[PDB]
Amino acid sequence: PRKVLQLLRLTRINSGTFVKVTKATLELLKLIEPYVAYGYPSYSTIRQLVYKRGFGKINKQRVPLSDNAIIEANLGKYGILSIDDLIHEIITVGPHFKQANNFLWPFKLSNPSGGWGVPRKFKHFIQGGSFGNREEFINKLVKSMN
Amino acid sequence: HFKEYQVIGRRLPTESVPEPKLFRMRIFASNEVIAKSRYWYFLQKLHKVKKASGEIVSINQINEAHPTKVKNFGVWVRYDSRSGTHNMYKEIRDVSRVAAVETLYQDMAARHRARFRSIHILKVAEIEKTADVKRQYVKQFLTKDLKFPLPHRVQKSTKTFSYKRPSTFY
Amino acid sequence: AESHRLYVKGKHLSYQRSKRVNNPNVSLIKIEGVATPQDAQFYLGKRIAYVYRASKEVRGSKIRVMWGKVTRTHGNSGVVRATFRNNLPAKTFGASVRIFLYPSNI
Amino acid sequence: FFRHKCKQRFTKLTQVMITERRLALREEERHYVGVAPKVKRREQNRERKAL
Amino acid sequence: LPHPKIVKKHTKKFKRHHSDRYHRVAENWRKQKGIDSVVRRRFRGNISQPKIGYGSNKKTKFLSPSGHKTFLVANVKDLETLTMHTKTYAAEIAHNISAKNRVVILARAKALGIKVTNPKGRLAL
Amino acid sequence: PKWYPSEDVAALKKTRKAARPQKLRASLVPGTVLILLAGRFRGKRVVYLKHLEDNTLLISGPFKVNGVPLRRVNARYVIATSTKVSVEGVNVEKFNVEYFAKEEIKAERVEDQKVVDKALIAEIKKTPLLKQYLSASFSLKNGDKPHMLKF
Amino acid sequence: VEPVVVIDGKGHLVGRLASVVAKQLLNGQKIVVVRAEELNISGEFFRNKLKYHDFLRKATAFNKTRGPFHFRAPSRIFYKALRGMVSHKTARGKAALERLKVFEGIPPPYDKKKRVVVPQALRVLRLKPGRKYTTLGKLSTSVGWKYEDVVAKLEAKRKVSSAEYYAKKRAFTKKVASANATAAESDVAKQLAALGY
Amino acid sequence: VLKKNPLKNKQVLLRLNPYAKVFAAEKLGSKKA
RNA sequence: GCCCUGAGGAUGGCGCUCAAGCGUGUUACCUAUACUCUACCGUCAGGGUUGAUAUGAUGCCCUGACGAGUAGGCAGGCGUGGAGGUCAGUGACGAAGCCUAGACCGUAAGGUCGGGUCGAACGGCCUCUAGUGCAGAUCUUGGUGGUAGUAGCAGCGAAACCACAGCCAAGGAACGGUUGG
RNA sequence: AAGCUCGUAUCAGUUUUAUGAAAAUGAAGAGCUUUUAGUGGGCCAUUUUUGGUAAGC
RNA sequence: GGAAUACUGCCAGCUGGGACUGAGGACUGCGACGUAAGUCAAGGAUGCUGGCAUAAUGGUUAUAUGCCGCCCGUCUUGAAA
């Protein structure tokens, strides 16, 4: 599981990244299911993440995203010339989803403001836990963390 | 707080078998994910369908028809414990099906030590007329002109010291 | 005439501490008449003054005062955290403290 | 660099000429005096003997 | 000059472990090489060993509370070097300077407006 | 000054902080009766007249009622009460920041205080017990909960 | 709220009462406990009596006196129960205990002063109805206490002449209420009623 | 030198997503079916 | 399902019974070096810099991450004996050393100054040099204590031993040296 | 540690796919001579066992 | 027959109470208001007020006390011992 987490750039707690849904990636998520929680983010959550904790990787440097010019200089090759374009590409998986995901630095999230909401985190979400696959509650979890 | 959900699956229709039996059942759960997981578990146990070849056609929430009408609920429950699995039947006088199933779960976790993991709700039905109830503790509340007091009320104190010597009269 | 008090008397319980570690920089203060965090929310930002008598006279008076402020609520019993310019001696556990109404918003 | 620093040096030297102000308005009655430890000893043990 | 507030990150001398308990052990810090030593393992409740974390800020480094860097002065010629850095450096007279030279040095420092870190040294008014 | 800087000092970067006027709380309205919390006149009920340009409130006892003269009091150190007294008949435009400058009481200050007291005494007497209420000081008693009391 | 609080220990649980008194003591509040002999403990009498024996059976061999001390007075038992709830052997704990006084009955001048009760520690408010309970006075008498007779005898006198004081207070309040009634319906009374008084 | 977090301080928010002004003026967030 | 039988001590104690015991579900709150934002030290990596810099391009700065650790490796520094050079250095108006319930500077090795004794050499800096830095080695030379004014032969007067020591209860490989009395 | 060729297609404590050889994620810090300190103690514990009877072992 | 409310999610919706931080150092850039001149919360705080030379304040010793901390070095065994 550690190798899969490293491949997904989940090198520290309260850190997450966008992963394309595929038959191969589903197996990877199942492998690291105990140690991670994932779901189906909505447009609002993706926009909030890209707006607040949106950091881009430029020549091995985690340059914060604060201007459309920054995205255009690096991501303008594929037609992504604004933060809105990046958000649209992330939410709507397209031909250049991989490049956009790689460019974005792994998100650094804090602990939930209202708490995880369960007495024991290390349990399946279907039984009052935290990890697993929470379809829509992932948005609420991220918003509290973000 | 529990909730009632309806889940239907038809095992990913393939060639020569369009629109399979379309198994239908009602699942009580606190969220859609738990309802889907319980539906999958029930399909695996009772039926031969597993999530490998399964498919969730649609999940919907059912609201009680009369949330302000008192009803007597008869519930058939099959649950597993340290011993072998066995059937069980109980009668609950509640207002809504969700409240009745929640009370049943609480009683099972209290008396029989059975929790949501090993409890199955086979069927929930409403008892229409009197004298069909088979439990004395439910018949207790069906008596005409039922009046009783509430002796020894546990009054709450907002301060450590009270210069009154409170009385528990009601 | 009979009373000139313009502050709400309270009690200093103890510093913010764990089971075996304490943080003197933060002090817990109990306010009379406060039972829930919502009630204590009104006292946030109020100046806290501890008044005690000193053996020596320095500025023409025998009373020395240490000032502080209310930071945030603590627990569900109305306890509110407080931070002072200089931490309390730790001998004032249960000592009476004064909470003023300024800076006021009402 | 040279022009700016030369101007700064000239200004500092000119404002250092204010020393005349201290010399013009000193009227001091202290005139820093230094006492050697040997003189201190002769002003202490002899004082004790005289007492 | 409103210089940045001086932060030291530490005010207690990093006394050597067991220095107080044993007289023969000097207070000068010396890292414990003991494999089983608790201090070497920085156990809770023990003294805090020096480390890079306590590094003082570059801008506030070598800054006295008055905000002027200390500079040793041995004679009037040495003091003259601080003519263009009076606001940033403070003259400090060596302990070996006699009163006869000290008075002259102080007079020149006052004339040039250079603050003296340790005045009234061996001089009585 | 003509003197060039004798030493190299870095100039301050262009600051961008406009001096926006104070956004006073709604409860503070001219003519409202105020209660002092801290200072020489702590606990003395006073009246609100005008808002000064230095983010301070011009408050009069009135002087003839409780002895409090025209003074500058910070808004944060004042409790605003629902009671109000007419102030349209009292002239306050004359007072300003320079009025309270201090360069044995100034005669002009006394005359202004007398004029203000004369103007405001009629309004104070317009309601019963208002003069007595203003004269009486404010203090707390056992069982008083400021977070529950209404002002 | 009060410089000194007098708590009536009659019909109260030893555990909850001791815990609340200790917590108040740690907060700098002076408390005086009265009528200790009337304190009650949950459970049947035999269980409480058996419990007492097993804590005094541990007498130290080499030095019994310097070892455990067995006190029979109900006030001593209550103090021992409260002592363990406070961080003793420390200056903070020792100072707090100085604020607590325990007496059998209501010795003066506390007999002439108001007393309070703790609602959360009342036996008739916490224990389930019909359940067995033990009385501290009877347990103390069984385990060696010899002052129950005198305690009851001089507590009966406490009620004596205090019933008379209450009768005099009732007579005075009769006239007070009459004066209030005859003073009602007046302009001042009407204004007070309108203003919530 | 300092990161200006959007979703607040509308000034920086208007720097990115120039459609924010249209969204706010048109009240598109509460659009009705 | 719960309860009883059914074979010097501690749920830690105080203690508790619609529990402050048991099972379940929901909210309310405490914190670790854990995580989010920011101030600072250093390492790495990248980058800017000159018809010269409003500070030694071995200079001055911008950007991102990182910082546990035994032996070992690399890098940068503190202190002393002496030597070449250097401050046309300090110093009987007091050099070195020592003391200091004095302060200052550096994360530290250490340096500076304030006050007392002291009296005649020593230091700021670039290099060279080594009999160059002590907490122990049942270490060596020297000095001083507990035992002890004790054993011992009114007076004279040790030695063995000495990290820390004799009120106790549970458990931390019989390890025994945190909850109470 | 120094050198050369360099940033890639050099790879993976990963997944699918294929055959019974083609993609996903991440890293472009990868490849070839020379030598240079230290390193061959084991405990806890699942599964096989080495097989079994009060048990261990 | 008809609306309302509960729940979920959104608001580039509005507006109060509290705590820490003030980092950079003459403009170069992204932006907003404004027909324009100009202004702005736009790559890090500004203005005003009160205390002060027999000062303000700060530094050292012990005791006053909230909590923690086994006696140091070498060596056995994978560890403690």
UniProtKB/Swiss-Prot annotation, chain A:
Subunit comment: Component of the large ribosomal subunit (LSU). Mature yeast ribosomes consist of a small (40S) and a large (60S) subunit. The 40S small subunit contains 1 molecule of ribosomal RNA (18S rRNA) and 33 different proteins (encoded by 57 genes). The large 60S subunit contains 3 rRNA molecules (25S, 5.8S and 5S rRNA) and 46 different proteins (encoded by 81 genes).
Question: What are the alphabetically sorted keywords of the record?
Answer: Cytoplasm, Ribonucleoprotein, Ribosomal protein
Location relative to the cell: Cytoplasm
Q: Which family does it belong to?
A: Belongs to the universal ribosomal protein uL30 family.
GO-annotated cellular components: cytoplasm; cytosol; cytosolic large ribosomal subunit
Which branch of life, at top level?
Eukaryota
Q: What else is known?
A: Present with 101000 molecules/cell in log phase SD medium. There are 2 genes for uL30 in yeast.
Organism annotation: Saccharomyces cerevisiae (strain ATCC 204508 / S288c) (Baker's yeast)
Respond yes or no to whether keyword Ribonucleoprotein is given for this record. Answer: yes
> What's a GO biological-process term for it?
maturation of LSU-rRNA
What is its biological role?
Component of the ribosome, a large ribonucleoprotein complex responsible for the synthesis of proteins in the cell. The small ribosomal subunit (SSU) binds messenger RNAs (mRNAs) and translates the encoded message by selecting cognate aminoacyl-transfer RNA (tRNA) molecules. The large subunit (LSU) contains the ribosomal catalytic site termed the peptidyl transferase center (PTC), which catalyzes the formation of peptide bonds, thereby polymerizing the amino acids delivered by tRNAs into a polypeptide chain.
Swiss-Prot record, chain B:
The record places the cross-link (Glycyl lysine isopeptide (Lys-Gly) (interchain with G-Cter in ubiquitin)) at K123, K129, K147
Q: Which coarse location class describes where this protein primarily resides? A: cytoplasm
Q: Where in the cell is it found?
A: Cytoplasm
Q: Which Pfam families match?
A: Ribosomal_L18A
Q: Does Phosphoprotein appear among the keywords?
A: yes
Where Phosphoserine occurs along the chain? S30
- Anything further noted? Present with 54300 molecules/cell in log phase SD medium.
Subunit info here reads: Component of the large ribosomal subunit (LSU). Mature yeast ribosomes consist of a small (40S) and a large (60S) subunit. The 40S small subunit contains 1 molecule of ribosomal RNA (18S rRNA) and 33 different proteins (encoded by 57 genes). The large 60S subunit contains 3 rRNA molecules (25S, 5.8S and 5S rRNA) and 46 different proteins (encoded by 81 genes). eL20 forms multiple interactions with RNA and proteins in the central protuberance, connecting components of core functional centers that are located far apart.
Q: What does this protein do?
A: Component of the ribosome, a large ribonucleoprotein complex responsible for the synthesis of proteins in the cell. The small ribosomal subunit (SSU) binds messenger RNAs (mRNAs) and translates the encoded message by selecting cognate aminoacyl-transfer RNA (tRNA) molecules. The large subunit (LSU) contains the ribosomal catalytic site termed the peptidyl transferase center (PTC), which catalyzes the formation of peptide bonds, thereby polymerizing the amino acids delivered by tRNAs into a polypeptide chain.
What this protein is called in its record is Large ribosomal subunit protein eL20A
Q: What gene is behind this protein? A: RPL20A
Swiss-Prot record, chain D:
Q: Which residues form a coiled coil?
A: none
The UniProt function text for this chain reads: Its role might be as part of the apparatus concerned with the nuclear events of the cell cycle.
Positions occupied by motif Nuclear localization signal: 37-42
Q: Where does it live in the cell?
A: Nucleus
The protein's name in its UniProt record? Protein MAK16
* Highest taxon listed in the record's lineage: Eukaryota
Q: Which family does it belong to?
A: Belongs to the MAK16 family.
Swiss-Prot record, chain E:
What is the protein name given in its UniProt record? Large ribosomal subunit protein eL32
SUPFAM superfamilies, alphabetized: Ribosomal protein L32e (SSF52042)
Main location as per UniProt:
cytoplasm
Which organism is the protein's source?
Saccharomyces cerevisiae (strain ATCC 204508 / S288c) (Baker's yeast)
Record's PROSITE patterns? RIBOSOMAL_L32E (PS00580)
Record-level GO cellular component terms: cytoplasm; cytosol; cytosolic large ribosomal subunit
Its biological purpose is as follows: Component of the ribosome, a large ribonucleoprotein complex responsible for the synthesis of proteins in the cell. The small ribosomal subunit (SSU) binds messenger RNAs (mRNAs) and translates the encoded message by selecting cognate aminoacyl-transfer RNA (tRNA) molecules. The large subunit (LSU) contains the ribosomal catalytic site termed the peptidyl transferase center (PTC), which catalyzes the formation of peptide bonds, thereby polymerizing the amino acids delivered by tRNAs into a polypeptide chain.
The record's subunit annotation is: Component of the large ribosomal subunit (LSU). Mature yeast ribosomes consist of a small (40S) and a large (60S) subunit. The 40S small subunit contains 1 molecule of ribosomal RNA (18S rRNA) and 33 different proteins (encoded by 57 genes). The large 60S subunit contains 3 rRNA molecules (25S, 5.8S and 5S rRNA) and 46 different proteins (encoded by 81 genes).
Query: Keywords of this protein's UniProt record, alphabetized?
Result: Cytoplasm, Phosphoprotein, Ribonucleoprotein, Ribosomal protein
Phosphoserine PTM positions read S37
Single Gene Ontology BP annotation = cytoplasmic translation
Keyword Cytoplasm on this protein?
yes
Q: Which domain of life is it from?
A: Eukaryota
Alphabetically, the GO molecular function entries are: structural constituent of ribosome
